[PDB]
Subunit: 190 residues, 3 copies
C-alpha cells in the first residue's frame, strides 16, 4: 500500500547492516612501501610527511573465503619514541571482486583501535554511507574490521557467514590462502 511503500523506502535509507572482514599482509605484494619524504648516519627517522602506499589481502569474516584486497595510502601525522600512538591519516578502498568496493577515510593509530569514515561504495555497496571499526590483531600485518553500512540492499549470505572471533591465532583456510575456486569471491581482486 501507499504507506507501506513509503515506509519501506525509508527503512532502506535509514537501515544499517554490519559486515566483518580480515585484512592480512602476507608479505608477497611488496607492501607496504615507505616514502621517507619527511626529514643516525644513514638511518631513517619518522616525521610528518612520510607517505606509505600499501595493499593487503582481504578475507571474509569466517576466514574461509578470499574476497579481494585493500589499496591506498597513509600519511604520517605525529609520532614519538613510543611504539603506541603514532598517528597516520589514511585514504583507501576495500575491493570485493565482482561484488564491488568500499572506500574509507580517517585515522590509523599504531596499537590503537580507530573508526574510519565510509565515504561510499560500488556494486552492491553503491550509495552506502557509515563507518568502519579498525581493530589491530597483530601489528601491523593482521587487522580486523567491522563496517556499519547504511542505505543499501540486504547483503548476500556469503558475506555474512559466522565470524571467527579476532585473535592472533585466527588464520585463513588453506583453500582460501591458495585461492581455490570454492573459496574465492567471483573474480576476487588481486
Amino acid at each position: 500500500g501507499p504507506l507501506g511503500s513509503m515506509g519501506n523506502k525509508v527503512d532502506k535509507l535509514a537501515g544499517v547492516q554490519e559486515l566483518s572482514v580480515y585484512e592480512i599482509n602476507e608479505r608477497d605484494r611488496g607492501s607496504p612501501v615507505i616514502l621517507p619524504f619527511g626529514g643516525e648516519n644513514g638511518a631513517h627517522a619518522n616525521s610528518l610527511g612520510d607517505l606509505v602506499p600499501f595493499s593487503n589481502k582481504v578475507y571474509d569474516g569466517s576466514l574461509q573465503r578470499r574476497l579481494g584486497i585493500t589499496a591506498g595510502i597513509c600519511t604520517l601525522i605525529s609520532h614519538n619514541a613510543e611504539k603506541k600512538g603514532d598517528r597516520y591519516e589514511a585514504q583507501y578502498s576495500f575491493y570485493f571482486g565482482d561484488y564491488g568496493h568500499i572506500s574509507v577515510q580517517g585515522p590509523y593509530i599504531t596499537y590503537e583501535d580507530t573508526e574510519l569514515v565510509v565515504t561510499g561504495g560500488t556494486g552492491i555497496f553503491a550509495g552506502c554511507h557509515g563507518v568502519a571499526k579498525l581493530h589491530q590483531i597483530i601489528f601491523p600485518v593482521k587487522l580486523f574490521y567491522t563496517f556499519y553500512l547504511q542505505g543499501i540492499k540486504k547483503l548476500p549470505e556469503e558475506l555474512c557467514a559466522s565470524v571467527v572471533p579476532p585473535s592472533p591465532s585466527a588464520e585463513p583456510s588453506e583453500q582460501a590462502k591458495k585461492c581455490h575456486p570454492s573459496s574465492v569471491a567471483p573474480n576476487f581482486t588481486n
Copy 2:
C-alpha cells in the same frame, strides 16, 4: 498535502540522476606528473567538457597512487582521489580504482553547489588511454540538474571532439566562470 510532502522528500532522498562528461588531456597543463614497481605517485589535472561536447565546464584535479602491475593485461592498478570542477555550479569528488587496461567504477563521495549532499557512483569509460575518457555520474539525493548539463550526449568514440568554440573557451560555450 501531508503525505504528498513526505513522499516528495523521500523521492529526493532516494532519487538518482545521470550526468555525463568528457575528460580530455590536451597536453597543455604539464599533466600528469609521473610507472614501474609500486608506490609511484601521479598528480594530475585535465579538462572537462559536457556530455554534448559543446561546452567547457572545468577540470579534474587530484592524485593517483600506483598499486600493482599486471603483465598479462599489460596494465597498472592505481588508487585515485580527485575532483571534477564545474565552475560556479560546484564540484564532485570521487575515490576508487583507476586501472590502465579497463573501465572501472568509482565512489562519488559528495559534491558542492548544485551537487551539495549528493552520493553515488561514477562509471569511468576509457576511449583512448590515457588522453580521452568518458564518465557517467549516478547521483543520488539532489534536486533536478539544470538543462545546460543534460544536453543530448554524444556517444563516446575516437571521433568525439569538443567543438571549436568550447576548445577556445568562447563565452557562448563555457560554464559560468568555468574552472581553469
Copy 3:
C-alpha cells in the same frame, strides 16, 4: 503514531545543522611540510577550536597536492583530503579545493561518532594566510548536535583568538579527551 514515527525519520535523514570551527597553526606541530609547480605534496596538522573560541576540540590532519599557479591572482590551487578530529565526539572527513587567494567549499565525505552517517559541505574561510582559518560545516542526516559544540559563534577576524584556558587545554575548556 505511525506517520509521526515515519515523519521524524525523514526529518532526520533530510535535516541540516550548522557547525562552525576555527583552525589555527600554532607552530608547535612541525606543520606543514612542503615537497616538490604541479605535484608538490603538503602534509599538515593544525589545532581546532570551537566556534566560540572558548574550547579546544582537537586537530586537523591530512594532505594537500599543488595543482596549479595563478600568476594573475598571485595564488595557488591545491586539492586536499583531510579530517577534523573532535576528541571523543568523533571526526569529520573532507575532500576538495584549497586556494590561497580565495574562499572555497569542500565536500563532507562523512563522519564518525556523533557525526556518523553525515554528508554535506564545509565552507572554508581564510582569515590570516595561512595560519588561521574559519570553517562552517553544513551537516545532513544526523541527530541534534550537543550544546558544547553549538555555543554563540565569534564572527571571524584577524584579532579572533582562543581563550587563555582553551589555549592551555584547561579541563574546563577542552572537548572530552581532545585530540592532540
